[PDB]
Design a protein around this ligand. Structure first.
Ligand code: HEM
Ligand code: HEM
Ligand SMILES: CC[C@H]1[C@H]2[C@H](C[C@H]1C)[C@H]1C[C@H]3/C=C/C(O)=C4/C(=O)N[C@@H](CCCNC(=O)/C=C\C[C@@H]3[C@H]1[C@@H]1O[C@@H]12)C4=O
Ligand SMILES: CC[C@H]1[C@H]2[C@H](C[C@H]1C)[C@H]1C[C@H]3/C=C/C(O)=C4/C(=O)N[C@@H](CCCNC(=O)/C=C\C[C@@H]3[C@H]1[C@@H]1O[C@@H]12)C4=O
Lengths: 390, 390
């Protein structure tokens, strides 16, 4: 069988996908776990993500297809199907609706401004990863949750552990133990002095209203503080690097600031954020997909980066066209597990581009593009550093 | 209770939504059937359409909230929840993927050109509704299914019965009898001799593969010949009118054809196609929506038109901006029942704007704007006629 993931470096999209688009659904071998099919057509990835005949739960003795040594297991949102998944997420739902997140726009800009004050002070050329991509989205969720600045580094360490392909089940226990200890102390603080932040809301959801158990309270906290900043950090960097590699760099968005939202969406579509893949889903019954009968219990991987370059949905898919305004990309997923933070990410990315265009309109690479240190072996594509000059 | 639908005329967005968006989920009373909540925020209409806790089936004795006198009931796709819905739909799925539908672009343009030849031959001013909006999408699906041209008028009549608010269960009996008779004949004919058309595919699905039963084959065919062209017909005229009512008319799209797909999407967002509403959904368990506890069994109506002008999703929502390339609209719906024809409709609307810009760049209203005969009190908004000049 073909082995997956395929060879690529940086944000490269590998040419093998252009072969597979026109073939039937193909089975691949993965680094750990059972084999799986590769959903790469737009409609197929949509199906895998959103159709009730695909379960995110391995209930028929499957060995989870994956790139990480330890199978991804827990009691939080990625471990549940609807309706259980739906009631649990609805504990967070109302804090991530556009109507709520839109109110954060100002604070996001403020934090972004502080970061850039600090970058400007450091002087050209500076590492935009260290000065902006890491700090800003981390502050955003940590102050949303109620985690003090000085502990941010702990949550980076736990999130890298989740995301590292070389993490073992032991490594995950160690994480679980450390994280539980941390939040447990935070729970006790909030019980004695209640706070208005999200963790406070979670503690009340548990203690007062009896809406969730302690296990669910911790699980949701773990999900947000794990999923909630490392992805945006990687994208802040990926997005700027994509833009600076263009002859005109930021100038189109300097000239036409009203096109920044569209630009954010095109980049969401075009950047292959993952060198791995997310959760496989499993057929709850036999079903047909791209010329193949997928049997009950068999795993299908949703390759969202291939979806976002489907030749039939997106003409000239490999071209970054910031005016494309393409059909709706799958970069935040689809169906039940559609990114609960999708609007917050869009706000964070719109705000980063606003602030860079307004403050550093002549922003450019601070080293030769050829010297950029892309992450090589990692679950997520991105940059170790992004030196920029102004 | 607040009565719904709200007063509006033509494609006017009624101002009352600007009130309701700020407020908690509100309950309305309908022309027929039980009362229901009005889902109007983006995220809420999404939930209603996509969340498994919302069923399209009244399984607890409910009287379907509606504007039509006779309740909407049958054996096709709008009468099913997943997975039963999913299994029936999958019989058609393959034929409506973008990969399949993109192959129809040539033929859709051919038919659009024939329509425009007749219009031009009729002479300025001419009615674009009669010459293009009605014939072209009717011909597209009927020839897809294998229905001959001379019989198109019959399918228009059956479709309007379904869509007319003044239709009784008796009128629906007549329709069903007439329609079943007609497709029965088509079935005999396809059984006596194979044809490579969509109805012929349904016949193979019933007779040869035993995938579906005879009344499901009929249902599916009825769904497609009912939903499959009156909507596109109404939008072709709605879209053209929207464009012709602006100072610049068609010139922005003449000048930049590459923006035609984006305009189609903005129009889909902006145009309130329904005066009424689609199917209500029923909560299958207690849940929270916009500050209200929706109890099990209670109905919630997804108001697509309102979601598409959600003030927090869409800044300045009332403005038709063809470059907006906004966050994805709910105009083709969402979840299980997301329009099976969405790509075909995008193809049809794109091709119509391509053909109109290329052939009639100085297209303009053929009568004074205030004379336009907008449909009054009908289920869908639109024009009885659209005189155009060139
Ligand atoms: C550019 C940044 C981001 C990207 C590209 C992204 C992408 C995604 C994708 C594709 C999924 C679904 C994976 C699957 O279905 O297998 C997901 C889920 C999730 N994301 Fe995001 N995300 C981003 C930012 C955020 C933010 C800012 C937050 C929270 C503050 C967040 C929290 C979550 C959570 C909790 C889930 C699981 C939701 C569920 O299973 O119900 N993400 N994200
Ligand atoms: C501008 C044109 C169109 C618009 C605005 C439109 C809109 C919609 C919407 C919003 C729904 C879902 C309603 C709900 O969930 O309550 C739907 C369903 C449906 N549409 Fe379309 N549609 C269009 C064109 C078409 C075309 C061209 C076809 C051709 C086959 C078609 C066939 C269907 C069918 C069969 C369903 C039911 C699907 C299901 O329940 O699984 N429609 N449409
Ligand atoms: C750029 C977007 C990427 C996403 C990525 C998929 C990509 C599209 C998911 C993959 C999740 C793995 C999760 C995971 O391995 C586990 C696990 O081992 N146990 C549980 C409970 C442990 C605590 N919760 C979590 O850590 C929950 C989410 C963290 C990540 C999350 C990242 O945001 C980035 C679980 O969810
Ligand atoms: C602008 C788009 C509009 C859509 C509209 C909702 C809007 C968003 C739906 C509403 C459906 C009503 C359906 C309906 O009344 C019935 C009924 O009475 N019996 C069944 C079986 C009868 C045979 N199937 C059908 O007629 C199936 C679809 C036709 C319409 C369909 C039109 O595309 C237009 C049924 O579905």
């Amino acid at each position: 069988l073909l082995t997956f993931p395929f060879a690529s470096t940086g944000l490269e999209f590998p040419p093998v996908y252009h072969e597979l688009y026109q073939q039937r659904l193909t089975k691949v071998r993965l680094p750990y776990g059972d084999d799986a099919y590769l959903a790469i057509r737009y409609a197929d990835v949509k199906t895998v993500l959103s159709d009730s005949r695909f379960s995110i739960v391995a209930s028929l003795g499957q060995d989870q297809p994956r790139t990480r040594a330890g199978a991804r297991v827990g009691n939080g949102l990625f471990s549940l199907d609807p309706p259980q998944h739906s009631r649990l997420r609805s504990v967070l739902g109302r804090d991530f609706t556009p109507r709520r997140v839109e109110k954060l726009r100002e604070r996001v800009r403020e934090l972004t401004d502080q970061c850039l004050d600090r970058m400007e002070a450091a002087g050209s050329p500076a590492d935009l990863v260290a000065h902006l991509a890491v700090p800003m989205p981390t502050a955003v969720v940590c102050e949303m949750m109620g985690v003090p600045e000085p502990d941010h580094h702990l949550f980076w360490g736990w999130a890298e552990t989740i995301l590292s392909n070389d993490t073992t089940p032991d490594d995950l226990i160690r994480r679980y133990q450390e994280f539980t200890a941390y939040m447990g102390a935070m729970v006790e603080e909030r019980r004695a002095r209640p706070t208005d932040d999200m963790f406070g809301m979670l503690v009340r959801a548990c203690d007062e209203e009896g809406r969730i158990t302690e296990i669910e309270m911790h699980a949701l906290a773990s999900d947000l503080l794990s999923a909630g900043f490392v992805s945006t950090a990687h994208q802040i960097a990926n997005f700027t690097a994509m833009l600076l590699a263009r002859p005109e760099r930021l100038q189109p968005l300097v000239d036409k600031p009203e096109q920044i939202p569209a630009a954010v969406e095109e980049l969401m579509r075009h950047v292959p954020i993952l060198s791995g893949f997310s959760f496989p889903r499993y057929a709850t019954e036999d079903l047909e997909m791209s010329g193949v009968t997928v049997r009950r219990g068999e795993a299908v991987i949703p390759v969202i980066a291939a979806a976002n370059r489907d030749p039939d949905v997106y003409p000239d898919a490999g071209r970054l066209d910031l005016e494309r305004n393409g059909l709706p990309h799958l970069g935040f997923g689809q169906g039940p597990h559609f990114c609960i933070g999708a609007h917050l990410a869009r706000v964070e990315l719109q705000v980063v581009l606003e602030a860079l265009t307004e403050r550093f309109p002549d922003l450019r690479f601070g080293i030769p593009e050829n010297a950029l240190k892309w992450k090589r072996g990692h679950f997520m594509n991105g940059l170790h550093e992004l030196p920029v000059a102004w």
